[model samples]
Target: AVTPPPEKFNFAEHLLQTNRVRPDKTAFVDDISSLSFAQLEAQTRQLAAALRAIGVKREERVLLLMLDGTDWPVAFLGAIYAGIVPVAVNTLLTADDYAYMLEHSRAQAVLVSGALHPVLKAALTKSDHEVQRVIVSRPAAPLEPGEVDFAEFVGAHAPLEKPAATQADDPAFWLYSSGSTGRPKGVVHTHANPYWTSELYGRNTLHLREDDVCFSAAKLFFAYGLGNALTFPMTVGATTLLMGERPTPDAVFKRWLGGVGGVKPTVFYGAPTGYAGMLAAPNLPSRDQVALRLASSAGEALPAEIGQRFQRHFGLDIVDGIGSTEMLHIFLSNLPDRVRYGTTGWPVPGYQIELRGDGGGPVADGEPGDLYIHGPSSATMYWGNRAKSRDTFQGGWTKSGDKYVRNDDGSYTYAGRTDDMLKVSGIYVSPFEIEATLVQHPGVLEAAVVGVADEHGLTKPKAYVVPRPGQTLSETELKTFIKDRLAPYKYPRSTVFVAELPKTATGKIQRFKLREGV
Candidate 1:
C-alpha cells in the first residue's frame, strides 16, 4: 500500500540534498567506524576528485577489489558520484578468476588491499588488462609490481569535482551473475535502473524508514546484496551495516544484538540460508527486543519451514522475493503486510509478471512456466554483450529463468527452475518440492535432487541426502519415506547419503555438482 515519494526523484541528487538537509546524521556505522552524512559526502567527493586527477574518466570501468567495509562504500558511491562505472569483483576470487575478469572487463585501474597483492600480481601477469595504475589501501607490504600508496595519493588531492553530468541511462555499476555454468557475465545497471528498482521496492514494498539499521549477509559483489542491503537503504536516507565476511549464525546474532546501539533493527534484508541459520540457533528470544519489523529474502527459494520458524521465534513474517542479476533487483516480492508463508508474493508496483512456456506463450494459471517480468527497473543491457542481452531481454520483458505457478489469490509459488524440473514417467517433478518434503522428515538434515541420464539416455530423478547428526535413515527407508509423502514416480529412484551437499556461497543447492556428469 506504500507509494513512492514523487515522480521526479533523482537518485544522485537525492543523496546530495539529504546531506545538505541533515549533514550530521550518521550515514554508515560498522564494527570499527562510522561516517556521518556530511563526512561521507566530503570524503566521497575527495576520492572522486583524486581519481579524476589520476586520469579516470566518466564511463570508464573501475574495478573495486578491496575488502567489504566502510572504505568499500566510500569507493563505491564515490565512483558513482564521479561518473566512473565501478565493477565489483569477488574478493574471494582466485588469481586466474581475477585475471579473466580484469581482462574481460577492460578495467582501467584497480583499488585493492595489501593482502590481495599476491593474487593481484599473478592475475595481472597473466592478463592483458592494461591496468594503467594500481592503488593500494595498505602499502606496508607491497603486492603489485608497481603500485601507488592510497594514503599518499589522497593526501595530495584537494576534493572531488562537481558531480558528473551523467544521464539516467549511463552505466553506474557492473555486477556479475553466479557463473556456475561458465565464466560470469558482467550484469550492468544504469544510474536510473537502480534508483527505479530500489525506490520501487523500498518505498512501495518494504516501506523502509530512515531509522532502520539494515543488514544483509549477501556479498557486495552479488547483485542481491548490493541493491537491497546497501544501496536500497542509502537511497532512502537510511543507515546500513555492511559485513566484511560471509554471515555465520554467531556473526549474525552478534550484529543483530549490538550493531544498532540498542535500537532494535527495524528491517532485515537477507537470503533464506541465513534466515534458516538464525532460526536454528539456540536462545533465540534474547534479541526479541530488537524490533526486526520487515524481513526480506531473495537470491533463492524460501523454504516454508524457515518462514514458519522465523515467525514462531521472532513474531515476524518473512517476505520472500525472486530477483535476478539481469533484472538489476527484485521485481516480484511479497510486501510485509501481505506475505504468504508458502508463496513468492505478487509483483511489486510498476511491474507486470507472467509465466511463459518454452515457445513464449503465457502459461495458464496453476501451471508452471518460466517467470517473465516487464518493468522500468529492468537493466537496459549487459555491458558490451549484445547477444546475451538480446537473449535475456525480449520485447519489453526480462526472462527470470525461474519456474512459478500463479495462485488463485494472485500470489505465485515457486516451482523450481525450468531447467531443473524433472520429468518422471510422463509426470513433472521439482527437486525443491521433493527436497522440501524430504527435509521434513526428522532424520533428514538436508537434501538435493537432480535428474540423471540413465541407460536409455532418459533422465531419472536422483537424490543426495545429508542425514541429521547421529541419526540413521537408510537408503531404502528414505526412499519409502518420500514415496508415502509424494506420488510414486516423483520419489527419488537413486539416492546417495552424504555429510553435506555442495552449495554456493549463498547456500543454494548445487545440484549439478552432485550429478554424475559433473
Candidate 2:
C-alpha cells in the first residue's frame, strides 16, 4: 500500500529525516567528490542559510543552472529547505535560452557550475534581469564583484536550524517544458510531487533499495533525471553515482565498471538513443564487468531490437517508461522483473492513463489516441502561463501530447507524437525552433525540419532547406551554424539542400508533408 506525505512537508526535510540514522552512509559519488548523508544534510542546510542571508526570501525563485554532481542535489534541496523555489534549467541550452529562463523565472539568485560560468555570464549580460547573487560551484577562475564561490558561501553561514513550514502542495521547484513553438513553459512542481513519483514509480516499479547504487544518464535538470539520480535514491538512503560529463558510451562504461570511486551502480537509467549508442559502441563492457541489476529507459520509446540485444548481453531487462516535466516522472512503465520488449508495460500504480480520440472521448483498444495521465505527481501549473496550463492540466487529467495504443495484454505501445515536436535522444526538439534558426542563417531562404526514423528506430531531426537566390549553403556550414547558436543536440543530424519545401497556399510550410517523405 502507498502512503501519503504529511500536511506540513518539505521535500528536502523529508529526505533529511528519511535518512537521519544513516548519517555516515555515502549518499552520492560524483566525478570529483562524494557526499555522505551527513554531509548532504549539513551542506543543504548551510546553503539554505546562505541564500536566506543573501536576501532570497520565501517563495522567491532561484536559478539552478549547474552540471550533475553533489552540488546539484544540495543546491536544489537547499533552496527548497528555505521555502524558496529553484528553477532548474537544462545545462545544454544556449545563452539565449538561459537568458529567457532567467528573465521568465525572475530568479533572485543563480547557482551555476564553474565550467559553465562563461555561458551564464553571457546570458546575464543579454538579459535585464539582475540576480541578487551569483554562486559558483568549483569556480574555473577568480570571481568578480557580487560573485561568490559555493563552498565559501556555505561556510560563511551556519546550517539552518529549521526548514520552512511548506505545505505539501506548495510550489517547491520549476522545470521548463519546451514546445514546438514559443518560449519554454516553466512547469511548477510541489514538494510532494517528487515524493509521490519516487513512491509510485521509483520504489514500486524499480524496487530501488537502500543498498542499491543508482546512476542516470539524464542530468539533474530533467524531471526524469531528478527522480532517477537524486530524489528516488535519497528517499531510500541509496547511493548515487553522478557523472558531470556527457553520457557517452565511454563515459557510462567508466561508471558502470566502477572506474570512478570504485562504486558500481546497481540501477542504471538512460534514454532510448543512449542505449542504442551504447549497444552500437565497441568499448562496451562484458556483463560480468558491470554491476547493474536493473536498468530504466525513458525519453523516447525503446526499440525492441535494442532492448533484446541488450538483454542478450547483460541478462537484464531495460525497463522502458514514459514521463514528462509536467508529470515529474514516469507514470507508465515496464517493471523490473516483468517486462515486454516493445511495450511500455502497465500503468504504474497510483496513476491513471487514458487514450482520448479527436471526439474528446476514450479511444477503443489498439487505436492510436492522444495520451492523458492523471496522477498525484502532476505539476501544479506552468508558471505564469495560464492558457498553456489550462490547455494541458484539465480538471483531473494532464494532456501528455503523446500518442499511444493499448494492447490486449494491458500494455501501451508508442505511436508518435500528436504535434510537430520530435524527440532526439529522449529530449524534445521543436521542428519550428530548428526551422526558425535555419532561416536566421544568411544563405538560408526557407526551411522545414522533421523527424525521420534512424537505423535504430529512434527519431533524428532532418532538415530540408532552400538556399537564398544566387546564394549557396553547405550542409556542413549550416550544421555548424546551428550547433553554435543552439544546443548542439538540436542541430540537424541530416541536412538536405532542396529547391523548396512543401507548402500550402496559405504559405504555411506543411511539416507533415516533409515528415511524410520518411
Best by lDDT: 2
User: What residue runs in model 1 are displaced by over 4 Å at the alpha carbon?
Assistant: 1-13, 138-140, 143-145, 259-264, 285-287, 420-518
TM-scores of the models, in the given order?
0.79, 0.98
lDDT (0 to 1) per candidate: 0.73, 0.91
| Deviation of model 2 at 160, angstroms | 0.4
- After superposition on all C-alphas, the RMSD of every candidate to the true structure, in Å, is 10.1, 1.2
Candidate 2, superposed: residue stretches over 4 Å from native: none
Model 2: weakest 10-residue lDDT segment is 509-518
Question: Model 1, poorest ten-residue lDDT window?
Answer: 1-10
In the range 104-215, model 1's lDDT, one tens digit per residue, is 7788888776777777878988988868888787654844455787656666677765788777776778876542244667887777777777778776678887777787
TM-score of model number 1:
0.79
